């Protein structure tokens, strides 16, 4: 105790691997204060972990949290898309802000260095997909220098991390709407190689008409890579951006932080890292607005 900088209280709905990984990351936040983990099974292994770490645990689900709504202003939903529909309805009615880490995609799709600044007041934000969080920054880095007519991303993840079809479509539509590409295509590839590989992504972009300012595009991409690295330290470009005519190719690799998820699960880790980053920017916005 004493005097302190203001923080926003947050709670994690879900007690599985994603929820536990979020909890590890939230401990390092200086603007978010994690207070509680919410599950449905009092014997949950993730609730035990959270109890041990000093947090409030709730094993009576969303209703149990809504009985103690002062625990949190921002809730991370790390359960499932089917469960998120009711969670979203009830959390919005209780005036809480929610970060959806599921594919339910009820709220606004956000990538923090691209379009978060237009969504600081949303009730519900969704983090799209791992491939989206990894590559939409790059598509945008290019599109804001020179309009992109077509972008294809190829996400290769370790096998140990209609699923494929639905995720490629949401990624591809995210590449268009948030990345800015007129047409987008997404490929997800699962690689069984042992030891497990770090997640890799390839971004192909075809830019539209006009003279190409190569230095400007490359500096925009390198700047984006640094910006993402600030909340995903293992996010890196593998070689320089390749130019051939109006075609630009960027090679990425995404090593996970290894907080609770393994380092080779960078596709899952980027989701919790991007969620924490989004919640921090929402938190700073909320703190600046209050009593007003």
For residue 6, say whether it is annotated as part of any ligand binding site: no
* 292 in a known ligand binding site: no
Residue 130 falls in the annotated catalytic set: yes
245 is in an annotated binding site: no
Measure Cα distances from 208 to 154, 229, 237 in Å: 21, 28, 24
Is residue 4 within 8 Å of 31, Cβ to Cβ?
A: no
Residue 69: helix, strand or coil by DSSP? helix
The structure tokens listed for 73 are 């202003």
Is 178 annotated in some ligand binding site? Answer: no
CB 153 within 8 A of CB 131: yes
| Measured distance CA(203)–CA(188) in Å, rounded | 12
Among the listed residues 187, 186, 189, 166, the one whose alpha carbon sits nearest the alpha carbon of residue 178: 186
Residue 159 marked ligand-binding: no
Q: Is 30 annotated as a binding residue?
A: no
Kindly provide the b/e burial profile for residues 60-98, where b requires at least 16 CB atoms within 10 angstroms of the residue's own CB. Answer: ebbebbbeeeebbbbbbbbbeeebbeebbeebeeeebbb
Q: Which of 13, 130, 270, 275 is catalytic?
A: 130
- Write out the binding residues: 15-18, 161-163, 267
Active site residues: 130
- Write out the binding residues for NAD(+): 15-18, 161-163, 267
């Amino acid at each position: 105790a004493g005097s302190h900088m203001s923080k926003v209280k947050v709670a994690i709905l879900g007690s599985g691997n994603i929820g536990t990984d979020l909890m590890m990351k939230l401990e390092r936040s200086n603007i978010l204060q994690l207070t509680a983990m919410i599950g449905i099974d009092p014997e949950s292994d993730g609730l035990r972990r959270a109890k041990e770490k000093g947090y409030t645990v709730i094993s009576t689900g969303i209703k149990g949290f809504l009985e103690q709504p002062e625990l949190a202003d921002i809730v991370f939903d790390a359960t499932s898309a089917k469960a998120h529909i009711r969670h979203a309805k009830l959390l919005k009615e209780a005036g809480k802000t929610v970060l959806d880490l599921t594919p339910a995609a009820v709220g606004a799709l956000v990538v923090p260095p691209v379009n978060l600044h237009k969504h600081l007041d949303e009730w519900n934000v969704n983090l799209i997909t791992c491939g989206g969080q990894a590559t939409i920054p790059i598509v945008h880095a290019i599109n804001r220098v020179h309009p992109v007519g077509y972008a294809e991303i190829v996400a290769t993840i370790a096998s140990k991390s209609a699923n494929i079809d639905e995720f490629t479509q949401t990624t591809a539509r995210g590449i268009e709407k948030i990345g800015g590409a007129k047409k987008g295509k997404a490929i997800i590839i699962l690689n069984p190689a042992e030891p497990p590989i770090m997640m890799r992504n390839t971004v192909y972009a075809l830019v539209e008409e006009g003279k190409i300012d190569e230095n400007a595009i490359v500096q925009s991409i390198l700047e984006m890579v640094k910006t993402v690295q600030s909340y995903v330290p293992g996010y890196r470009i593998r070689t320089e951006p390749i130019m051939d005519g109006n075609k630009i190719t960027v090679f990425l690799e995404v090593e996970g932080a290894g907080d609770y998820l393994p380092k080779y699960s960078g596709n899952l880790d980027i989701m919790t890292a991007a969620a924490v980053k989004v919640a921090e920017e929402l938190a700073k916005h909320k703190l600046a607005a209050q009593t007003a």
